[PDB]
Amino acid sequence: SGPVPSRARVYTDVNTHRPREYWDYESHVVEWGNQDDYQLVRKLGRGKYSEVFEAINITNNEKVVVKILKPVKKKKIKREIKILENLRGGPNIITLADIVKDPVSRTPALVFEHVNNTDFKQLYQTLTDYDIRFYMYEILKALDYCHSMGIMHRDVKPHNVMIDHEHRKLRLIDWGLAEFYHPGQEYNVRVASRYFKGPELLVDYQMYDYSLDMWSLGCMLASMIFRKEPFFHGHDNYDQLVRIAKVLGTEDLYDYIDKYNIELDPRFNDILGRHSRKRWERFVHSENQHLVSPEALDFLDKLLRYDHQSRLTAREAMEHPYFYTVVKD
């Protein structure tokens, strides 16, 4: 009895066949740079796990960004550092430039390339149909890369997608929640922002994979093309699943949990209800129709599936007709 196991349908065995040093981040040995190379200019932001500063690298006169990690498990720190080093140079992956020991926090400070960002409230108010297709494709490059390298991001959301719109430059950031995918491994479901959490997380299914990121990407896409941010706006993790079910319907939710022999929290008995699956056209109106096309809706439809094994992979997504109009390098 109990839930049915699951495996990724792609990149299943990447970490199996890479050497142990690649994924065994607990044994990684950090090469420290010199903290005096970087002069902090201003604080950019603060989160649960870090503070971020604009800085100058006074050895080359280049702007950088410094992420000073808040005290946390050595394991979580080494995990992020190892993942960043493994992915460095990949398409639209934020580039780790240095690692220093901050003298005040006495924790690692990660030094990254500087991206001249516009925060996603003003940007998302402007982006055209063409812009959204372009930047989605750029996100997909990053996701196929990290998935192909055995890593799931697990925190895909607008805040973690930096865009310097002037230079049409995109970087996927904050790999602090990212993990190595190992077939059969059970993972923490307390990942991703509420609004971007996949159904697998919301029904407490731990044996998930790269396809989690594709659900999150779908949530981003829906918010952008329908001009509703966030799209699934739950007030807590339970209501989050109810909001999803009011769109995707309850019958396919039950098919999903029945497939994996998953049982819903009895707390859903009085709040879930019975809901038909809705057609995506109902979210189209005169103020977002310029961002919507049959191709957009089909693409969105193929990302937002309950069954994590049924979602487009990043590579499959890049083959979708939605991207036919995007100029390719």
- Considering only 16, 59, 116, 128, the residue that binds ligand JWQ (CB under 6 A) is 116
Q: How far is the CB of 139 from ligand JWQ (least distance, A)?
A: 15
The answer to whether 172 contacts ligand JWQ (rule: CB under 6 A) is no
- Considering only 112, 187, 208, 299, the residue that binds ligand JWQ (CB under 6 A) is 112
- Considering only 37, 54, 129, 301, the residue that binds ligand JWQ (CB under 6 A) is 54
Q: By C-beta, is 141 or 153 nearer to ligand JWQ?
A: 153
The answer to whether 77 contacts ligand JWQ (rule: CB under 6 A) is no
The answer to whether 10 contacts ligand JWQ (rule: CB under 6 A) is no
How far apart are the C-alpha atoms of 264 and 283, rounded to whole Å? 28
- 155 is a catalytic site residue: yes
The answer to whether 173 contacts ligand JWQ (rule: CB under 6 A) is yes
Q: How far is the CB of 59 from ligand JWQ (least distance, A)?
A: 19
Q: Which of 98, 144, 155, 213 is catalytic?
A: 155
Token pair for residue 39? 């002069």
How far apart are the C-alpha atoms of 319 and 328, rounded to whole Å? 12
- Could you tell me which of 159, 147, 150 has the C-alpha nearest to residue 123? 159
How far apart are the C-alpha atoms of 37 and 3, rounded to whole Å? 52
Which residues make up each annotated binding site for ATP?
44-52, 67
- Point out which residues bind ligand JWQ (CB under 6 A): 44-45, 47, 50, 52, 54, 65, 67, 94, 112, 115-117, 173-175
Catalytic residues: 155
